[PDB]
PDB file of C-alpha atoms in Angstrom:
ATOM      1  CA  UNK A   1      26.078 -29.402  60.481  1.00  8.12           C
ATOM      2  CA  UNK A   2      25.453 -27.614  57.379  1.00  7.12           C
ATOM      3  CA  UNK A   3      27.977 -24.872  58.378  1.00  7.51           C
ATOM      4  CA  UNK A   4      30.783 -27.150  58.380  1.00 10.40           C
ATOM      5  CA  UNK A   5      29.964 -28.329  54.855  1.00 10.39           C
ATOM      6  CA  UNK A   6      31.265 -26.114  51.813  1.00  8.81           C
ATOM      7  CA  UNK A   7      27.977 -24.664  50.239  1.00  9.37           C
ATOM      8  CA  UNK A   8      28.576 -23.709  46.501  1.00  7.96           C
ATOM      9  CA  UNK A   9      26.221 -21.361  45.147  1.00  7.03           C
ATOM     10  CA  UNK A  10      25.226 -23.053  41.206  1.00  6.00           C
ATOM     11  CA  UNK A  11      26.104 -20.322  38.167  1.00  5.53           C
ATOM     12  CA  UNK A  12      25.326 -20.601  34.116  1.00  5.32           C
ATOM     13  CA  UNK A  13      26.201 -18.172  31.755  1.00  4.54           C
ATOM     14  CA  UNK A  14      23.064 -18.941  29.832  1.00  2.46           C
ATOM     15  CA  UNK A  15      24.298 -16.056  27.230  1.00  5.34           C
ATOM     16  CA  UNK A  16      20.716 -15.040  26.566  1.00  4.70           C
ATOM     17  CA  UNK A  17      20.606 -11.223  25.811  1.00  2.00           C
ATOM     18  CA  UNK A  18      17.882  -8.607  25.597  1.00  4.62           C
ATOM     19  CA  UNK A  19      16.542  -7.394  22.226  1.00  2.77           C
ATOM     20  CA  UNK A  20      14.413  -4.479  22.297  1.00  2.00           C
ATOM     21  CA  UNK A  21      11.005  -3.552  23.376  1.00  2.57           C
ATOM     22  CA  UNK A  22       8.344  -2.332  20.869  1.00  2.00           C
ATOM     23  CA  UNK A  23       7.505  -4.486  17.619  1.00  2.00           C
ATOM     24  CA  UNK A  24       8.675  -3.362  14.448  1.00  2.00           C
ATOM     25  CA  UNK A  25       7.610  -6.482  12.204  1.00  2.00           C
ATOM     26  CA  UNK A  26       5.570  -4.596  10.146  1.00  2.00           C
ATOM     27  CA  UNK A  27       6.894  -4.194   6.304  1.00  2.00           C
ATOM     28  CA  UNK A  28       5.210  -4.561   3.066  1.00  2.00           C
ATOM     29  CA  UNK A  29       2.675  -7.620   3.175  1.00  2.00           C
ATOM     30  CA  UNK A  30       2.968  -7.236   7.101  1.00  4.05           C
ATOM     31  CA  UNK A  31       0.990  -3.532   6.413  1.00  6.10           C
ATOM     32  CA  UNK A  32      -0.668  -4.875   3.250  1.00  2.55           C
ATOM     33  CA  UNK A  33       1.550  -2.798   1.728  1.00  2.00           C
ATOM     34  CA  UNK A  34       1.250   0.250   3.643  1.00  2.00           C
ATOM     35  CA  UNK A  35       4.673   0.308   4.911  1.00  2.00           C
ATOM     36  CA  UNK A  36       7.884  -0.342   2.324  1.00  2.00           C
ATOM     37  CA  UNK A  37      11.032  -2.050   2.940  1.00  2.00           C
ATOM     38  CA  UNK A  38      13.595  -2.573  -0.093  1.00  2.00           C
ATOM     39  CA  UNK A  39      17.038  -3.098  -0.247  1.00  2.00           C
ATOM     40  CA  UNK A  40      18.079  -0.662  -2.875  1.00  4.42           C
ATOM     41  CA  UNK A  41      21.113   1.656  -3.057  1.00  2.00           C
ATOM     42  CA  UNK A  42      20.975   5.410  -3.957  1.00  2.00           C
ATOM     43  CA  UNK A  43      23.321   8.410  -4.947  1.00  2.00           C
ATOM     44  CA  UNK A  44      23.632  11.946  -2.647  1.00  2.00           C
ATOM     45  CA  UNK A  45      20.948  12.726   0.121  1.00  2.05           C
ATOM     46  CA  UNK A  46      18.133  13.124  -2.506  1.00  2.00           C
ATOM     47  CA  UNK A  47      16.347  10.790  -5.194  1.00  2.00           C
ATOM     48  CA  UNK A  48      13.913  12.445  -7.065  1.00  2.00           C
ATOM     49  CA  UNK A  49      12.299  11.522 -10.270  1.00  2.00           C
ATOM     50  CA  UNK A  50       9.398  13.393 -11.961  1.00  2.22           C
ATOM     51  CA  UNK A  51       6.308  12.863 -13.475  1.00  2.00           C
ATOM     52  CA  UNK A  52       3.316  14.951 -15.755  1.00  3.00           C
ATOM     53  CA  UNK A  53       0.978  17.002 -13.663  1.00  3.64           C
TER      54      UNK A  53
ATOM     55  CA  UNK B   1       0.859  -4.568  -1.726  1.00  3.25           C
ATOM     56  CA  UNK B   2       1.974  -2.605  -5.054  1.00  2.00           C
ATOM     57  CA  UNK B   3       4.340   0.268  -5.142  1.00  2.00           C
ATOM     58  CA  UNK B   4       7.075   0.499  -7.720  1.00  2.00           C
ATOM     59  CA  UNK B   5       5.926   1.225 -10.718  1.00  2.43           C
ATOM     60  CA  UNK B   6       6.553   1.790 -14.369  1.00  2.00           C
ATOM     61  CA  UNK B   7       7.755   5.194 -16.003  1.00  2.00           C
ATOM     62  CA  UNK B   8       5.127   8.543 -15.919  1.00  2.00           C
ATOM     63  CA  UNK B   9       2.286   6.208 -14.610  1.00  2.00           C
ATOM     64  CA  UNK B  10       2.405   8.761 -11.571  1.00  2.00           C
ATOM     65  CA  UNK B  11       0.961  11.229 -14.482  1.00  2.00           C
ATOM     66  CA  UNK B  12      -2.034  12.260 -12.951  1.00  2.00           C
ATOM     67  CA  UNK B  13      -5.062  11.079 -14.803  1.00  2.00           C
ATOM     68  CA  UNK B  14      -8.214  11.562 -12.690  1.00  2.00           C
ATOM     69  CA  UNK B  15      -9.065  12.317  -9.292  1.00  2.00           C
ATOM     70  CA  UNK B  16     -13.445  11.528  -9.343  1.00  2.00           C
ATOM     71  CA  UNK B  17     -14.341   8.302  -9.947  1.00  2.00           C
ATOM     72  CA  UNK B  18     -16.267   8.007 -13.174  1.00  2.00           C
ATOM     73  CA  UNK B  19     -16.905   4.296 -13.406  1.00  2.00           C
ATOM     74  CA  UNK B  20     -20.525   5.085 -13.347  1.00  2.00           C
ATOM     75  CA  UNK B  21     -21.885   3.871 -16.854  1.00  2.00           C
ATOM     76  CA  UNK B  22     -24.299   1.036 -18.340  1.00  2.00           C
ATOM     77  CA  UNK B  23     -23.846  -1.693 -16.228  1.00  2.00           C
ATOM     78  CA  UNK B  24     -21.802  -0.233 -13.148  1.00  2.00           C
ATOM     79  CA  UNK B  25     -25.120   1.491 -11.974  1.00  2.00           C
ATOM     80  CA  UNK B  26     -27.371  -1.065 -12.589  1.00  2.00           C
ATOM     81  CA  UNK B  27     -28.060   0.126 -16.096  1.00  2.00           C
ATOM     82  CA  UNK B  28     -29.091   3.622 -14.514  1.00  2.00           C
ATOM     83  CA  UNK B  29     -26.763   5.690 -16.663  1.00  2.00           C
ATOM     84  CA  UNK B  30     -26.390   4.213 -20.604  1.00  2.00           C
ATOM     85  CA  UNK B  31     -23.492   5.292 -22.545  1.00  2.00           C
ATOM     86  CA  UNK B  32     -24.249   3.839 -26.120  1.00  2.00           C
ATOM     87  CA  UNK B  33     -21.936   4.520 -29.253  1.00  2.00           C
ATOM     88  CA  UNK B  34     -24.122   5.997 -32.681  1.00  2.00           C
ATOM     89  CA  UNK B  35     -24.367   8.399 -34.915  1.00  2.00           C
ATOM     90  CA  UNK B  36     -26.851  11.388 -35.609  1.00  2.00           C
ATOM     91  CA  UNK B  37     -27.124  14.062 -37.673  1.00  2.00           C
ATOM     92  CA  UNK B  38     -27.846  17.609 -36.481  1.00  2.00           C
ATOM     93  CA  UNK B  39     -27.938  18.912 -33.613  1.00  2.00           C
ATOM     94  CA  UNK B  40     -30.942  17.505 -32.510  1.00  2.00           C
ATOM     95  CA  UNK B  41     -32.441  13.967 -32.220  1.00  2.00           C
ATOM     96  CA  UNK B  42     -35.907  14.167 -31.561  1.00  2.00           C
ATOM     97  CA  UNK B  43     -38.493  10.896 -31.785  1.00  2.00           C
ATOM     98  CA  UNK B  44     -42.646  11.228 -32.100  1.00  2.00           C
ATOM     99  CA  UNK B  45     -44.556   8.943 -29.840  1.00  2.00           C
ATOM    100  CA  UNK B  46     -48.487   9.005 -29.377  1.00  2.00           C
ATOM    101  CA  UNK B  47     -49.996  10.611 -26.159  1.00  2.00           C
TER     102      UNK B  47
END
């Protein structure tokens, strides 16, 4: 019978992790330009540059 | 798509639109370019 038999239960470690869970691919042409990502570097807490009122 | 821009172009310059001249409003308002004398510019035409 089936009892006398050895029955091995099949495993994987398919390694296949979670992500996240809202969508966040929307940067510059993604939001026409609404939204900005760059990639650039700045001094202190605060950048600020003026201009003529 | 355009953000970065070049030096004091955030200088305010207008806020209304005024692109409202000759051919923009289908020739409804006419800004022309000549001279006159005086303070008035009047022209005679029969009734």
């Amino acid at each position: 019978a089936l009892s006398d038999l050895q029955v091995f239960n099949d495993w994987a470690y398919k390694t296949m992790s979670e992500v996240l869970d809202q969508q966040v691919e929307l940067f510059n042409g993604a939001t026409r330009g609404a939204i900005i990502l760059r990639s650039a570097g700045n001094t202190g807490d605060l950048s600020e540059a003026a201009f003529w009122a």
